[PDB]
Structure formats: C-alpha cells, structure tokens
Design an enzyme around this catalytic site. Structure first.
Site, short mmCIF file in Angstrom:
data_model
loop_
_atom_site.label_atom_id
_atom_site.label_comp_id
_atom_site.label_asym_id
_atom_site.label_seq_id
_atom_site.Cartn_x
_atom_site.Cartn_y
_atom_site.Cartn_z
CG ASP A 1 -2.02 1.06 1.13
OD1 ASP A 1 -2.44 1.43 0.01
OD2 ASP A 1 -2.46 1.53 2.20
CE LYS B 1 -1.55 3.18 -4.21
NZ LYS B 1 -1.35 2.57 -2.86
CG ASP C 1 -5.66 -0.20 -0.55
OD1 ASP C 1 -6.80 -0.57 -0.87
OD2 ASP C 1 -5.44 0.91 -0.02
CG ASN C 2 -5.20 2.10 -3.26
OD1 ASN C 2 -4.28 2.06 -2.43
ND2 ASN C 2 -6.36 2.68 -3.01
CD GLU D 1 -8.34 5.03 0.75
OE1 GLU D 1 -8.74 3.99 0.17
OE2 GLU D 1 -7.15 5.41 0.72
O1 LIG Z 1 -7.23 7.71 -3.90
C1 LIG Z 1 -6.03 7.95 -3.80
C2 LIG Z 1 -5.43 9.21 -4.44
C3 LIG Z 1 -6.46 9.82 -5.38
N1 LIG Z 1 -7.18 11.04 -4.88
C4 LIG Z 1 -8.17 11.57 -5.87
C5 LIG Z 1 -8.88 12.75 -5.31
N2 LIG Z 1 -9.59 12.38 -4.05
C6 LIG Z 1 -10.50 13.38 -3.61
C7 LIG Z 1 -10.63 13.81 -2.23
C8 LIG Z 1 -11.55 14.80 -1.86
C9 LIG Z 1 -12.38 15.42 -2.83
C10 LIG Z 1 -12.25 15.01 -4.18
C11 LIG Z 1 -13.10 15.61 -5.27
F1 LIG Z 1 -13.14 16.94 -5.03
F2 LIG Z 1 -12.57 15.50 -6.44
F3 LIG Z 1 -14.26 15.16 -5.17
C12 LIG Z 1 -11.35 14.02 -4.55
C13 LIG Z 1 -8.62 11.93 -3.03
C14 LIG Z 1 -7.88 10.74 -3.56
C15 LIG Z 1 -5.15 7.00 -3.05
C16 LIG Z 1 -5.77 6.01 -2.28
C17 LIG Z 1 -4.94 5.00 -1.51
O2 LIG Z 1 -5.56 4.05 -0.78
C18 LIG Z 1 -3.53 5.08 -1.60
O3 LIG Z 1 -2.87 4.14 -0.91
C19 LIG Z 1 -2.95 6.13 -2.40
N3 LIG Z 1 -1.47 6.28 -2.54
O4 LIG Z 1 -0.72 5.50 -1.94
O5 LIG Z 1 -1.02 7.18 -3.22
C20 LIG Z 1 -3.74 7.06 -3.11
C1 LIG Z 2 -1.51 5.17 1.32
S1 LIG Z 2 -0.15 5.51 2.41
C2 LIG Z 2 -0.33 4.08 3.53
C3 LIG Z 2 -1.50 4.13 4.46
C4 LIG Z 2 -1.63 2.89 5.34
N1 LIG Z 2 -1.40 1.69 4.49
C5 LIG Z 2 -3.05 2.85 5.89
O1 LIG Z 2 -3.78 1.93 5.55
O2 LIG Z 2 -3.36 3.82 6.66
C6 LIG Z 2 1.27 5.03 1.52
C7 LIG Z 2 2.58 5.28 2.22
O3 LIG Z 2 3.56 4.71 1.33
C8 LIG Z 2 4.76 5.24 1.70
N2 LIG Z 2 5.95 5.38 0.88
C9 LIG Z 2 5.85 5.51 -0.50
N3 LIG Z 2 6.68 4.80 -1.21
C10 LIG Z 2 7.41 4.12 -0.26
C11 LIG Z 2 8.49 3.18 -0.36
N4 LIG Z 2 9.00 2.79 -1.55
N5 LIG Z 2 9.03 2.65 0.79
C12 LIG Z 2 8.51 3.05 1.98
N6 LIG Z 2 7.51 3.93 2.19
C13 LIG Z 2 6.99 4.44 1.02
C14 LIG Z 2 4.47 6.78 1.82
O4 LIG Z 2 5.42 7.59 2.50
C15 LIG Z 2 2.99 6.77 2.23
O5 LIG Z 2 2.87 7.21 3.62
MG LIG Z 3 -4.18 2.51 -0.25
#
Ligand SMILES: O=C(CCN1CCN(c2cccc(C(F)(F)F)c2)CC1)c1cc(O)c(O)c([N+](=O)[O-])c1
Ligand SMILES: C[S@@+](CC[C@H](N)C(=O)[O-])C[C@H]1O[C@@H](n2cnc3c(N)ncnc32)[C@H](O)[C@@H]1O
Ligand SMILES: [Mg+2]
EC number: 2.1.1.6
Length: 213
Positions: A139, A142, A167-168, A197
């Site tokens: 997680d 990506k 995840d994702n 989420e």
């Molecule tokens: O979903 C994303 C990112 C994508 N992003 C699009 C925008 N969006 C959001 C918020 C408020 C409001 C609105 C809107 F205004 F557009 F409705 C949109 C929040 C979310 C995501 C999720 C994960 O579980 C991860 O681990 C992860 N990592 O690791 O990078 C990323």
């Molecule tokens: C979506 S968040 C994790 C949230 C957590 N899994 C949860 O469920 O609350 C992803 C995390 O990946 C960590 N990060 C990104 N790339 C990484 C890597 N290659 N090694 C270690 N940490 C990394 C980031 O700093 C970020 O906090």
């Molecule tokens: Mg995630």
C-alpha cells in the site's frame, strides 16, 4: 501544523488509550467528517480483518505505514508472538505511526522501518531476523508494487503460501502489478471488490498467493 498531526491529535483527544478499536473509529470519523486521508479505511479494512483471521499470520510485512491506520488494524488481530514490520520512507509519517501505535498500546507487536522499501527489503533477513514472510500488505506508491514484489522474490522472502494483499488495484490502479500477478503461474489471485476509503468510488483489494517458482 499538518493533516497527519491533526489526525493524531484528534485520536489523543477522542480515542481511548490502549483501545485499538476506538483508535480506528476515531481516525475514520475524522477523515469522514473533516479531511480525507489515504488510510485503507473501514470498508476495505473489514475485508482485511477477515483475511487476517483466516490465515492467522505470524510474520507480516506492510509497505507504506502513513499514520499507522492499517498497522493498528492488522496488529490488533495478531496472535501472541506474531510480528508486524512496516516500512515508511517519510520520517514525519513514521513518527506519527509510532505515536499512533503507542497510544493504541500495540507498540510491542510492531516495528517501524524508516526508509525506502527498495533499500530495506534486501536487509530484512540480516538485520531483522526474518526467514520468510507469511503475509505482505502492499500500500505504498503504486509504481513500486511490481518492482518490490520482484525484489521480495529475489531475496527469498516469499515461500509457497505467502499471501500478498494489495490495495488500490482499481483506484488509483496498479496496471503492471495486476497484469503481472494475474498472468503468472506463480500466483493464485482473488479479487475483493469494495470502495475507496471515505468515498462511493469502487476500488478493491487483490489477494495473490505465492505458489513458488
Ligand atoms: O485515492 C487515492 C489518491 C487519489 N485522490 C483523488 C482525489 N480524491 C478526492 C478527495 C476529496 C475530494 C475530491 C473531489 F473533489 F474531487 F471530489 C477528490 C482523493 C484521492 C489514493 C488512495 C490509496 O488508498 C492510496 O494508498 C494512495 N497512494 O498510496 O497514493 C492514493
Ligand atoms: C496510502 S499511504 C499508507 C496508508 C496505510 N497503508 C493505511 O492503511 O493507513 C502510503 C505510504 O507509502 C509510503 N511510501 C511511499 N513509497 C514508499 C516506499 N518505496 N518505501 C517506503 N515507504 C513508502 C508513503 O510515505 C505513504 O505514507
Ligand atoms: Mg491505499
């Protein structure tokens, strides 16, 4: 202050010390009503709980801790003697995660590895006395899912039966990883459809069980 700091403060002023459950609910509430945060969440979290219960892993590796939501989620279900190692490259987030675990009273089961997965994975067996992993939770960024999976295999950290939970796989998506594991005869994949989420957007977790070379 920062968003992560506000979440931590929210938990300290609202959750019950030593109660992992209240901690989880405090975080989900805050993120549901105040600020969206990239925690796995309760919808996907419940699926995680069910998978953990089935496999009852002794050694779990998490890639990407952030604020410690999933670490608290998984650790609260670990059997005595089980260990959870979580990697977090952002030192600020690693600090929050440590505080989150302490407040939840799960600090004894979890070890935070501060650094990038690509640099730490090659050091797991030597520095942390790890033979093979029972389960891995992917997680982090990506674009690292596939390369890190290959790294784990190269370093002999996977064994027949090791469970990889990602995840994702739908949103934001993990194109190469998903294509690779579903097409490889080394993995048995199962998809669990859920929701992103704190939103109505469809997302999902992919379970890929390593079968060996
Ligand atoms: O979903 C994303 C990112 C994508 N992003 C699009 C925008 N969006 C959001 C918020 C408020 C409001 C609105 C809107 F205004 F557009 F409705 C949109 C929040 C979310 C995501 C999720 C994960 O579980 C991860 O681990 C992860 N990592 O690791 O990078 C990323
Ligand atoms: C979506 S968040 C994790 C949230 C957590 N899994 C949860 O469920 O609350 C992803 C995390 O990946 C960590 N990060 C990104 N790339 C990484 C890597 N290659 N090694 C270690 N940490 C990394 C980031 O700093 C970020 O906090
Ligand atoms: Mg995630």
């Amino acid at each position: 202050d920062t968003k992560e700091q506000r979440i931590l403060r929210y938990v300290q002023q609202n959750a019950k010390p030593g109660d992992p459950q209240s901690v989880l609910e405090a975080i989900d509430t805050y993120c549901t009503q105040k600020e969206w945060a990239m925690n796995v969440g309760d919808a996907k979290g419940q699926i995680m709980d069910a998978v953990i219960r089935e496999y009852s892993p002794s050694l779990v590796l998490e890639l990407g801790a952030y604020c410690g939501y999933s670490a608290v989620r998984m650790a609260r279900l670990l059997q005595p003697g089980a260990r959870l190692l979580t990697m977090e490259m952002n030192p600020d987030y690693a600090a929050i995660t440590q505080q989150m675990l302490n407040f939840a009273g799960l600090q004894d089961k979890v070890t935070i590895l501060n650094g990038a997965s690509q640099d730490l994975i090659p050091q797991l067996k030597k520095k942390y006395d790890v033979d093979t992993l029972d389960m891995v939770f992917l997680d982090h960024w990506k674009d690292r899912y596939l390369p890190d999976t290959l790294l784990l295999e190269k370093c002999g950290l996977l064994r027949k039966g090791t469970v990889l939970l990602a995840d994702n796989v739908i949103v934001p998506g993990t194109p190469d990883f998903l294509a690779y594991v579903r097409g490889s005869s080394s993995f048995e994949c199962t998809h669990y459809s859920s929701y992103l989420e704190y939103m109505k957007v469809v997302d999902g977790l992919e379970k890929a069980i390593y079968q060996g070379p």
